[PDB]
Amino acid sequence: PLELTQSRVQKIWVPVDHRPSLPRSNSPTVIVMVGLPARGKTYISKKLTRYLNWIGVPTKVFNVGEYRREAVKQYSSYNFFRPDNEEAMKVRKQCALAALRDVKSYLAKEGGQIAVFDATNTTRERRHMILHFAKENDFKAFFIESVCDDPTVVASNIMEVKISSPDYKDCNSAEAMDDFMKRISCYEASYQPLDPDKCDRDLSLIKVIDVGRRFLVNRVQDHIQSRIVYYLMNIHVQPRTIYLCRHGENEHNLQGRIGGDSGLSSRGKKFASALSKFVEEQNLKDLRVWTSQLKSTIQTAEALRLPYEQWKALNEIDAGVCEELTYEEIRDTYPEEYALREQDKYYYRYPTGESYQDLVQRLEPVIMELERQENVLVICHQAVLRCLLAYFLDKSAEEMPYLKCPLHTVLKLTPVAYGCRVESIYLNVESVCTHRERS
Amino acid sequence: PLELTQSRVQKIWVPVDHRPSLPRSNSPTVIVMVGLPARGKTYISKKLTRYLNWIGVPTKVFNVGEYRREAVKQYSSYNFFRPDNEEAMKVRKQCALAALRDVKSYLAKEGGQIAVFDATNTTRERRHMILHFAKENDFKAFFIESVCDDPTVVASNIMEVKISSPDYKDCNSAEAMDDFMKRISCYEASYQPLDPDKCDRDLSLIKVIDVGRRFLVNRVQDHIQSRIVYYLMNIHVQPRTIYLCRHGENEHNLQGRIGGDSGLSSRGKKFASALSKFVEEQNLKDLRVWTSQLKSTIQTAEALRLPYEQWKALNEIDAGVCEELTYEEIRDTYPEEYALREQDKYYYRYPTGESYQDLVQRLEPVIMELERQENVLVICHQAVLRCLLAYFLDKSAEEMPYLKCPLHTVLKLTPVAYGCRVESIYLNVESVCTHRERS
Ligand SMILES: N#Cc1c(N)n(Cc2ccccc2)c2ccc(Oc3ccc(NC(=O)CN)cc3)cc12
Ligand SMILES: N#Cc1c(N)n(Cc2ccccc2)c2ccc(Oc3ccc(NC(=O)CN)cc3)cc12
Ligand SMILES: O=P(O)(O)OC[C@H]1O[C@](O)(CO)[C@@H](O)[C@@H]1O
Ligand SMILES: O=P(O)(O)OC[C@H]1O[C@](O)(CO)[C@@H](O)[C@@H]1O
């Protein structure tokens, strides 16, 4: 009794499945965005979706405006958003219902876990309809409202991401700004904010007040909602830069050996000096420096003459029994293991070691702290860097083990208009190449 | 250049410190509890302190009532708490100032990081005085207010932990309840709740409303405050049971070998059956079962015929190079390593392996999820179990590696009146002993 087998790829112990002659084969969530236009609802939707997908929760944004741009060919003006525009009001409702139809298909038929319903959802009527849709489909509903009265914040959002919208292609900055202000005004009369005190007392919600200065949290039901709330409380919209790089070339790199805790080669030491000059030239008022607990990243940070913090979570992927071996020695000693990894690089777990999937779980606290911080330099390792980069660049689990993260190269990340601007800076020091493409 | 040495105990790479001829050698936080008596302030203080200490943040509670019980020998009645009691009002202020004096000494001179100031702090005047004390000593201030108007909740708190207070030793349940209600009334007139809208807008605070049904979060400044907020949102006061046990005896246990991924011995399989009978006899409506990804815990869970979830975070401490070795083989092959561990069992890191300190960091998400859940059975390993037990039993880092966690024994944890009631249930199946006392 209790016969188990270890799955070849993930190394998970499962009950031996001696299928008979005829082999026979929790609740999803609708995140409801709430608020007036230019309140960062799309910014929240996109960032939260990026984080949830990276941690392994399949998430998708359903933006009602995109359904509208598809149904109504060319956008002319705020007149489309008028409350007295009978025809456009019918079209807008149809677009919201078509988005909900795609929400049902995503959560009930496509293996999606979270659907972010990105719309104004400013009226109790619209929200009651979304709740009815959730209850009838056995979906949980979690509301995220963004409340802000600052005209500087509103004007800045219009200038940064609204004027550049496909709706304002034929318009100049002044026309687009004026039209958008009138467009916001169309929503102000019927806007009923969330009321957790009386009306929305039984709803699970978060009210993000004054661009995250204050929060009203009501009835957090589960793990995922609690995580979202913690995430929203850790992120900020302050300007900053994230620099990511690997340790300078090490002795194992020269021998083509994986893992281990070898020190910097002569070229690696040259990169470390080059990195110090680069850091100095960036003229950053304050900079946090993070390393792994492995020698090569610490030696690189030592060259900076700056305080640094060592994180065990930043240590390179653990290769288990394959540690300190070359890829040729892995193919010759463990050919089955080598081929299994090549076929499923993200989920593959090394024997007594890790997978890229395990790395994500380990790096989640790193990501949360990266979000809290401002200027940060992370000196790490190839697999760790691919994982962090997949988070910032919204790369899938399938692409993550193949992202190009060369040695002696700084990846400069600048958060701007929904995404991250990525600049690469090679510090002109030769090294070996450790990148291996798929087969 | 960049000469580093690896510290023998923790295995941390540090710059080689060639001290010259004459060798030369962030801000603490005051957590302010706010609210009327019988609002769970002491419950919050104690639980939060237990969590913060376990994760490695030195934390201490300063309860003003304990300073009062020390200054004023015997407690007679609510008359001591009267606003017109000039003498007792002076004494109570002196007690609060004496507690603050000990807060300053703890944070500035004893290496304490967090001081939980456990008092009513119901008036703006008292809170302004605490803020002045924090600003002058360069301490951060974070307010935690508990607001509840439910008379059932208040009466239940008086019955559960107030009537049994050293103040009510000579009183019967009815006298003590009546005196305590009058005592609460003494505070109601001068009570000024936190106002993050106008008056307390610049204060860093959390308002816990209706026993954690709702939260008002204002100006979370840093990492530790964000963590506290996340913790408060994950804990609950619902009745439940936590069962903790190790996998049934394995083949490595019989050989006296550490680590590895061996399967259950014949006795281990007998324990697994005994555990199923025990679980069945507990008659729990719902029960979550958690295991590690190691075979022995999964085989134990397989005997239950219940759904279970495997956590890589529950995997036994990694012994690095010492994996699959007996303690005799460790002492003979690695005598320096063996002696270093015996001297500093909590901080000692195995080469390419872990410390109990690393285990805590790995187990933090397990603890957070254990808090969210109700009835949970955790089937794990000796070092993992000691770490989890140290959290629930408020054991120090020094005691943690020596806690007794025998094989074939269930530790039944029942949360009641500030602590955890611990019941041990041996399932009458023989095994080897893996416990090793200090030398
Ligand atoms: N109202 C409004 C908002 C707005 N205009 N934006 C766009 C924006 C982009 C880049 C820079 C500034 C604003 C936002 C971007 C995000 C946003 O929601 C937030 C903002 C901040 C937090 N949390 C915190 O800041 C707590 N440390 C959580 C959610 C609100 C707005
Ligand atoms: N008012 C009041 C409270 C009160 N009487 N107690 C004592 C208590 C002990 C055991 C059982 C029930 C209540 C409390 C114990 C804790 C407490 O503060 C909480 C309560 C709940 C949370 N969070 C959540 O429940 C969110 N899942 C965070 C903090 C408030 C009270
Ligand atoms: O997943 P991949 O492509 O093998 O890359 C990860 C490897 O890269 C290295 O960082 C350097 O080759 C190794 O230490 C690690 O095993
Ligand atoms: O810290 P200690 O006392 O060595 O106990 C941890 C050890 O106990 C075991 O779980 C069983 O002996 C080992 O796998 C592990 O190395």
mmCIF file with all atom_site columns, C-alpha atoms in Angstrom, chain A residues 1-2 4 6 12-13 15 196-197 213-223 226-227 229-230 233-234 261 264 269 272 293-295 298-299 302-303 308 310 312 318 349 353-354 358 369 372, chain B residues 1-2 4 6 12-13 15 196-197 213-223 226-227 229-230 233-234 261 264 269 272 293-295 298-299 302-303 308 310 312 318 349 353-354 358 369 372:
data_model
loop_
_atom_site.group_PDB
_atom_site.id
_atom_site.type_symbol
_atom_site.label_atom_id
_atom_site.label_alt_id
_atom_site.label_comp_id
_atom_site.label_asym_id
_atom_site.label_entity_id
_atom_site.label_seq_id
_atom_site.pdbx_PDB_ins_code
_atom_site.Cartn_x
_atom_site.Cartn_y
_atom_site.Cartn_z
_atom_site.occupancy
_atom_site.B_iso_or_equiv
_atom_site.pdbx_formal_charge
_atom_site.auth_seq_id
_atom_site.auth_comp_id
_atom_site.auth_asym_id
_atom_site.auth_atom_id
_atom_site.pdbx_PDB_model_num
ATOM 1  C CA . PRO A 1 1   ? 0.000   0.000  0.000   1.00 0.00 ? 1   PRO A CA 1
ATOM 2  C CA . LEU A 1 2   ? 0.743   3.764  -0.429  1.00 0.00 ? 2   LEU A CA 1
ATOM 3  C CA . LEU A 1 4   ? 3.933   6.410  -5.234  1.00 0.00 ? 4   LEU A CA 1
ATOM 4  C CA . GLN A 1 6   ? 8.037   10.499 -8.843  1.00 0.00 ? 6   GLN A CA 1
ATOM 5  C CA . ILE A 1 12  ? 6.399   15.350 -7.676  1.00 0.00 ? 12  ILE A CA 1
ATOM 6  C CA . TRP A 1 13  ? 5.462   12.156 -5.779  1.00 0.00 ? 13  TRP A CA 1
ATOM 7  C CA . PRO A 1 15  ? 0.048   7.813  -6.376  1.00 0.00 ? 15  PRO A CA 1
ATOM 8  C CA . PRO A 1 196 ? -18.823 50.143 2.481   1.00 0.00 ? 196 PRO A CA 1
ATOM 9  C CA . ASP A 1 197 ? -20.574 51.893 5.427   1.00 0.00 ? 197 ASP A CA 1
ATOM 10 C CA . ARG A 1 213 ? -2.121  57.641 0.335   1.00 0.00 ? 213 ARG A CA 1
ATOM 11 C CA . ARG A 1 214 ? -5.099  55.949 2.106   1.00 0.00 ? 214 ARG A CA 1
ATOM 12 C CA . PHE A 1 215 ? -7.077  52.686 1.732   1.00 0.00 ? 215 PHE A CA 1
ATOM 13 C CA . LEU A 1 216 ? -10.522 51.463 2.761   1.00 0.00 ? 216 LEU A CA 1
ATOM 14 C CA . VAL A 1 217 ? -10.543 47.644 2.864   1.00 0.00 ? 217 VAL A CA 1
ATOM 15 C CA . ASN A 1 218 ? -13.839 45.827 3.273   1.00 0.00 ? 218 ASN A CA 1
ATOM 16 C CA . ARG A 1 219 ? -14.543 42.094 3.734   1.00 0.00 ? 219 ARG A CA 1
ATOM 17 C CA . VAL A 1 220 ? -11.372 40.457 2.312   1.00 0.00 ? 220 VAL A CA 1
ATOM 18 C CA . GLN A 1 221 ? -12.721 36.903 1.773   1.00 0.00 ? 221 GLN A CA 1
ATOM 19 C CA . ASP A 1 222 ? -9.650  34.957 0.653   1.00 0.00 ? 222 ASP A CA 1
ATOM 20 C CA . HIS A 1 223 ? -5.896  34.507 -0.049  1.00 0.00 ? 223 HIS A CA 1
ATOM 21 C CA . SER A 1 226 ? -5.437  39.605 0.686   1.00 0.00 ? 226 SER A CA 1
ATOM 22 C CA . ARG A 1 227 ? -2.381  39.329 -1.662  1.00 0.00 ? 227 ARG A CA 1
ATOM 23 C CA . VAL A 1 229 ? -4.398  44.386 -1.048  1.00 0.00 ? 229 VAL A CA 1
ATOM 24 C CA . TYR A 1 230 ? -0.795  43.784 0.192   1.00 0.00 ? 230 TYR A CA 1
ATOM 25 C CA . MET A 1 233 ? -0.054  48.837 -0.455  1.00 0.00 ? 233 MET A CA 1
ATOM 26 C CA . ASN A 1 234 ? 3.570   48.098 -1.545  1.00 0.00 ? 234 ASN A CA 1
ATOM 27 C CA . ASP A 1 261 ? 30.075  29.337 -5.393  1.00 0.00 ? 261 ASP A CA 1
ATOM 28 C CA . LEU A 1 264 ? 35.280  36.418 -10.033 1.00 0.00 ? 264 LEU A CA 1
ATOM 29 C CA . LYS A 1 269 ? 36.876  41.912 -11.540 1.00 0.00 ? 269 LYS A CA 1
ATOM 30 C CA . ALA A 1 272 ? 33.035  45.088 -11.185 1.00 0.00 ? 272 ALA A CA 1
ATOM 31 C CA . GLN A 1 293 ? 24.673  35.159 -0.783  1.00 0.00 ? 293 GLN A CA 1
ATOM 32 C CA . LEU A 1 294 ? 26.996  33.721 -3.460  1.00 0.00 ? 294 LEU A CA 1
ATOM 33 C CA . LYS A 1 295 ? 30.604  35.049 -3.578  1.00 0.00 ? 295 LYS A CA 1
ATOM 34 C CA . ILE A 1 298 ? 29.249  40.032 -3.288  1.00 0.00 ? 298 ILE A CA 1
ATOM 35 C CA . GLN A 1 299 ? 32.704  40.557 -4.894  1.00 0.00 ? 299 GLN A CA 1
ATOM 36 C CA . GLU A 1 302 ? 32.450  45.142 -3.053  1.00 0.00 ? 302 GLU A CA 1
ATOM 37 C CA . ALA A 1 303 ? 33.905  47.124 -6.037  1.00 0.00 ? 303 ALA A CA 1
ATOM 38 C CA . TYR A 1 308 ? 24.713  46.376 0.075   1.00 0.00 ? 308 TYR A CA 1
ATOM 39 C CA . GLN A 1 310 ? 22.656  39.991 0.677   1.00 0.00 ? 310 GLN A CA 1
ATOM 40 C CA . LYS A 1 312 ? 19.468  34.196 -0.021  1.00 0.00 ? 312 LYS A CA 1
ATOM 41 C CA . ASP A 1 318 ? 19.731  25.077 -7.394  1.00 0.00 ? 318 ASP A CA 1
ATOM 42 C CA . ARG A 1 349 ? 13.014  20.390 -11.551 1.00 0.00 ? 349 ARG A CA 1
ATOM 43 C CA . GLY A 1 353 ? 17.147  20.898 -6.978  1.00 0.00 ? 353 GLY A CA 1
ATOM 44 C CA . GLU A 1 354 ? 14.854  23.562 -8.403  1.00 0.00 ? 354 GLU A CA 1
ATOM 45 C CA . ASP A 1 358 ? 10.425  27.330 -7.724  1.00 0.00 ? 358 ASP A CA 1
ATOM 46 C CA . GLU A 1 369 ? 10.464  44.776 -1.894  1.00 0.00 ? 369 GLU A CA 1
ATOM 47 C CA . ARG A 1 372 ? 8.427   49.388 -2.254  1.00 0.00 ? 372 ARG A CA 1
ATOM 48 C CA . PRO B 1 1   ? 41.524  43.088 -4.541  1.00 0.00 ? 1   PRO B CA 1
ATOM 49 C CA . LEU B 1 2   ? 37.957  42.118 -3.428  1.00 0.00 ? 2   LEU B CA 1
ATOM 50 C CA . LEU B 1 4   ? 36.472  37.786 0.964   1.00 0.00 ? 4   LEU B CA 1
ATOM 51 C CA . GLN B 1 6   ? 33.284  32.791 4.351   1.00 0.00 ? 6   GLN B CA 1
ATOM 52 C CA . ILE B 1 12  ? 28.326  34.465 4.782   1.00 0.00 ? 12  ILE B CA 1
ATOM 53 C CA . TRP B 1 13  ? 30.993  35.947 2.465   1.00 0.00 ? 13  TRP B CA 1
ATOM 54 C CA . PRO B 1 15  ? 35.451  41.235 3.293   1.00 0.00 ? 15  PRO B CA 1
ATOM 55 C CA . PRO B 1 196 ? -7.418  59.980 9.388   1.00 0.00 ? 196 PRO B CA 1
ATOM 56 C CA . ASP B 1 197 ? -9.786  62.304 7.439   1.00 0.00 ? 197 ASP B CA 1
ATOM 57 C CA . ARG B 1 213 ? -14.494 42.960 9.202   1.00 0.00 ? 213 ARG B CA 1
ATOM 58 C CA . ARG B 1 214 ? -13.218 46.335 7.844   1.00 0.00 ? 214 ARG B CA 1
ATOM 59 C CA . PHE B 1 215 ? -9.924  48.297 7.899   1.00 0.00 ? 215 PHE B CA 1
ATOM 60 C CA . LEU B 1 216 ? -8.918  51.933 7.461   1.00 0.00 ? 216 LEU B CA 1
ATOM 61 C CA . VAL B 1 217 ? -5.233  52.127 6.471   1.00 0.00 ? 217 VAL B CA 1
ATOM 62 C CA . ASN B 1 218 ? -3.505  55.496 6.442   1.00 0.00 ? 218 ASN B CA 1
ATOM 63 C CA . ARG B 1 219 ? 0.023   56.435 5.296   1.00 0.00 ? 219 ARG B CA 1
ATOM 64 C CA . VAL B 1 220 ? 1.893   53.085 5.498   1.00 0.00 ? 220 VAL B CA 1
ATOM 65 C CA . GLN B 1 221 ? 5.497   54.408 5.490   1.00 0.00 ? 221 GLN B CA 1
ATOM 66 C CA . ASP B 1 222 ? 7.597   51.238 5.359   1.00 0.00 ? 222 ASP B CA 1
ATOM 67 C CA . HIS B 1 223 ? 8.133   47.445 5.022   1.00 0.00 ? 223 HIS B CA 1
ATOM 68 C CA . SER B 1 226 ? 2.998   46.972 5.419   1.00 0.00 ? 226 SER B CA 1
ATOM 69 C CA . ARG B 1 227 ? 3.769   43.463 6.841   1.00 0.00 ? 227 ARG B CA 1
ATOM 70 C CA . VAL B 1 229 ? -1.251  45.368 7.930   1.00 0.00 ? 229 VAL B CA 1
ATOM 71 C CA . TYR B 1 230 ? -1.027  42.184 5.763   1.00 0.00 ? 230 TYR B CA 1
ATOM 72 C CA . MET B 1 233 ? -5.794  41.113 7.385   1.00 0.00 ? 233 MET B CA 1
ATOM 73 C CA . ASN B 1 234 ? -4.883  37.367 7.378   1.00 0.00 ? 234 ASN B CA 1
ATOM 74 C CA . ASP B 1 261 ? 13.767  11.459 0.291   1.00 0.00 ? 261 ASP B CA 1
ATOM 75 C CA . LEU B 1 264 ? 7.899   5.035  5.091   1.00 0.00 ? 264 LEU B CA 1
ATOM 76 C CA . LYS B 1 269 ? 2.892   2.915  7.424   1.00 0.00 ? 269 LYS B CA 1
ATOM 77 C CA . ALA B 1 272 ? -0.206  6.604  8.750   1.00 0.00 ? 272 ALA B CA 1
ATOM 78 C CA . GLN B 1 293 ? 7.116   17.561 -1.401  1.00 0.00 ? 293 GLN B CA 1
ATOM 79 C CA . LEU B 1 294 ? 9.106   14.732 0.232   1.00 0.00 ? 294 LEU B CA 1
ATOM 80 C CA . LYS B 1 295 ? 7.779   11.148 -0.202  1.00 0.00 ? 295 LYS B CA 1
ATOM 81 C CA . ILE B 1 298 ? 2.896   12.336 1.018   1.00 0.00 ? 298 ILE B CA 1
ATOM 82 C CA . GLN B 1 299 ? 2.704   8.583  1.834   1.00 0.00 ? 299 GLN B CA 1
ATOM 83 C CA . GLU B 1 302 ? -2.182  9.082  1.237   1.00 0.00 ? 302 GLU B CA 1
ATOM 84 C CA . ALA B 1 303 ? -3.423  6.889  4.170   1.00 0.00 ? 303 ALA B CA 1
ATOM 85 C CA . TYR B 1 308 ? -3.982  17.283 0.419   1.00 0.00 ? 308 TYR B CA 1
ATOM 86 C CA . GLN B 1 310 ? 2.113   19.673 -1.161  1.00 0.00 ? 310 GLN B CA 1
ATOM 87 C CA . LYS B 1 312 ? 7.965   22.832 -1.108  1.00 0.00 ? 312 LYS B CA 1
ATOM 88 C CA . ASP B 1 318 ? 18.569  21.202 3.634   1.00 0.00 ? 318 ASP B CA 1
ATOM 89 C CA . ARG B 1 349 ? 24.231  26.931 8.046   1.00 0.00 ? 349 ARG B CA 1
ATOM 90 C CA . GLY B 1 353 ? 22.576  23.973 2.873   1.00 0.00 ? 353 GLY B CA 1
ATOM 91 C CA . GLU B 1 354 ? 20.369  25.760 5.388   1.00 0.00 ? 354 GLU B CA 1
ATOM 92 C CA . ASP B 1 358 ? 16.629  30.073 6.687   1.00 0.00 ? 358 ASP B CA 1
ATOM 93 C CA . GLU B 1 369 ? -1.700  30.721 5.286   1.00 0.00 ? 369 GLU B CA 1
ATOM 94 C CA . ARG B 1 372 ? -6.057  32.433 7.195   1.00 0.00 ? 372 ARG B CA 1
#
